[PDB]
Every structure is written in C-alpha cells, then in structure tokens.
Amino acid sequence: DTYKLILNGXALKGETTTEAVDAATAEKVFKQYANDNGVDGEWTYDDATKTFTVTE
C-alpha cells in the first residue's frame, strides 16, 4: 500500500510517499529519508490514513 510522510524541519516542509509491504517497512524507509534531509525529531503515525509525521 501507499504510505505518506509529512516532514516539518521548520522553514522547510514537505511530503513524500513510499510503496511498502507494511507500516514497519515504510517507517524504516521514512526514518532514513528524514535523516538524509536534515529533519530529526518527533514522530507520529496515523494508522487510519497510513500517514507518518516527523517534526524537528
């Protein structure tokens, strides 16, 4: 299924997606995406909409 990540670094905000087999596998992809783009901090997950957020 399609999973979504909403990043908030502060000034820079964005949204990416990933096609993953389960929520844990999307989470791993998103965690390394966030780190590679300078956003590190507070995570959330909305199971009903397959949506993660990470906020600096």
Author numbering: 1 to 56
Reported in the publication:
Our earlier results indicated that the β-branched amino acid d-Val at the i + 1 site stabilizes a type-II′ β-turn more than d-Ala. Thus, we synthesized 2, with d-Val–l-Ala in loop L1, which readily crystallized and X-ray diffraction data were collected to a maximum resolution of 1.9 Å. The structure of 2 overlaps closely with the tertiary structure of GB1 (backbone RMSD 0.39 Å), although with a significant displacement of loop L1. Gratifyingly, the d-Val COi+1 and l-Ala COi+2 in the type-II′ β-turn engage in an n → π* interaction, where the torsion angles of l-Ala at the i + 2 site (ϕ, ψ = −59.7°, −42.2°) are remarkably close to the mean torsion angles of a right-handed α-helix (ϕ, ψ = −62°, −41°)42. Thus, to obtain a quantitative estimate of the n → π* interaction energy (En→π*) at the i + 2 residue in 2, 3, and 4, we resorted to NBO analysis, which clearly indicated a decreasing En→π* in the order 2 > 3 > 4. The Ramachandran plot of the i + 2 residue in the type-II′ β-turn of 2, 3, 4, and 5 revealed that, as the strength of the n → π* interaction increases, the torsion angles of an amino acid in a non-helical region in the absence of the stabilizing intramolecular hydrogen bond are gradually altered to occupy the right-handed α-helical region. Therefore, we chose to substitute the solvent exposed COi+1 in the type-II′ β-turn of 2 by CSi+1. Thus, towards the synthesis of i + 1 thionated GB1 (d-Valt–l-Ala; 2a) (the thionated residue is denoted by superscript “t”), we obtained a clean 46-mer polypeptide up to the l-Alai+2. However, on completion of the 56-mer 2a on a solid support, following the acidolytic removal of protecting groups, the mass spectrum corresponded to a 45-mer fragment without the l-Alai+2.
Thus, we chose to engineer the loop L1 of the 56-residue immunoglobulin-binding domain B1 of the streptococcal protein G (GB1).35–38 The solvent exposed loop L1 in wild type GB1 is a type-I β-turn with lysine at the i + 1 position and threonine at the i + 2 position that lacks a COi+1 → COi+2 n → π* interaction. However, to have a better control over the turn conformation, we decided to introduce a type-II′ β-turn. Through subsequent X-ray crystallography and computational analysis of synthetic GB1 proteins with amino acid substitutions at the i + 2 residue of the β-turn, we show that amino acid side-chain identity and its rotameric conformation have a direct influence on the strength of an n → π* interaction. Gratifyingly, the thermal denaturation of the GB1 proteins shows a good correlation between their stability and the strength of an n → π* interaction at the β-turn.
